[PDB]
Amino acid sequence: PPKRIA
Amino acid sequence: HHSSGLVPRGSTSEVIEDEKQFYSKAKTYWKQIPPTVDGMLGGYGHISSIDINSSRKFLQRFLREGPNKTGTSCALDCGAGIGRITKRLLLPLFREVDMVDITEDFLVQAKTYLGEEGKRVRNYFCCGLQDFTPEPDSYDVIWIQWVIGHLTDQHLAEFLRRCKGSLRPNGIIVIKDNMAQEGVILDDVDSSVCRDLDVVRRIICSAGLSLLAEERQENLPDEIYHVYSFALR
């Protein structure tokens, strides 16, 4: 998926 | 052209320590994810329409404009999951669609999820892309979205080379994926990598694919990685 900048 | 896509080895995501585990952990992860749009998008189901709208505009340029228009007879959805993209992007634009995905449970659900237009899905292939060979001269568009992070650098290059041999005249491959701010970043939850733009362009071009178009997705939530689309052949 798209995902949060870690 | 070697039908296996073989190329010499170049660069490596040295962030991938054990390739066998990189693949087995991802296969395990997806086997327990619910076969739903929320499962496909990791809690970002609310951007699905925005995503599809941009993809449609991007692809329509190749189908509608130019002297050597891309055809509309058949598309391949790579890493298709339950068919979110096949249903809302590809089936409205291509006469028939094939799907390939590693997760059996998602291909099974796709029959239900796609509804009546799913009867225009010709083949449901269950395979990892690293092991998959699309049929020669078969597809006008090969769509590869949010799955390149699941392949090693070498397998990505070889897969794209196999894809090239699967395109019909004027066909294109599209990659749409997350791009890291810099370098290569491993997500140890789903066992995938995010790569920066320069890294991805180098993999494509060093594999012998021609980059036709590149576009950053606008209007996404502030907190997520940038998403880019590339057209190649």
Curated annotation (Swiss-Prot), chain B:
Annotated residues for binding of S-adenosyl-L-methionine: G79, R84, D101, I102, T103, L129, Q130, Q145
A GO molecular-function descriptor: histone methyltransferase activity
CDD domains, per the entry: AdoMet_MTases
Impact upon substituting N178A: Decreased methyltransferase activity
Outcome when changing S192A: Induces a slight decrease in methyltransferase activity
Impact noted for substituting D177A: Does not affect methyltransferase activity
Catalytically driven reaction(s): N-terminal L-alanyl-L-prolyl-L-lysyl-[protein] + 3 S-adenosyl-L-methionine = N-terminal N,N,N-trimethyl-L-alanyl-L-prolyl-L-lysyl-[protein] + 3 S-adenosyl-L-homocysteine + 3 H(+); N-terminal L-seryl-L-prolyl-L-lysyl-[protein] + 3 S-adenosyl-L-methionine = N-terminal N,N,N-trimethyl-L-seryl-L-prolyl-L-lysyl-[protein] + 3 S-adenosyl-L-homocysteine + 3 H(+); N-terminal L-prolyl-L-prolyl-L-lysyl-[protein] + 2 S-adenosyl-L-methionine = N-terminal N,N-dimethyl-L-prolyl-L-prolyl-L-lysyl-[protein] + 2 S-adenosyl-L-homocysteine + 2 H(+)
GO biological process, one term: N-terminal peptidyl-glycine methylation
Cystine residue pairs: none
Record keywords: Acetylation, Methyltransferase, Nucleus, S-adenosyl-L-methionine, Transferase
Class in the EC hierarchy, top level: transferase
EC numbers for this chain: 2.1.1.244
Subcellular location: Nucleus
Effect of D190A: Induces a decrease in methyltransferase activity
GO CC, alphabetical: cytoplasm; cytosol; nucleoplasm; nucleus
Name of the molecule in the record: N-terminal Xaa-Pro-Lys N-methyltransferase 1
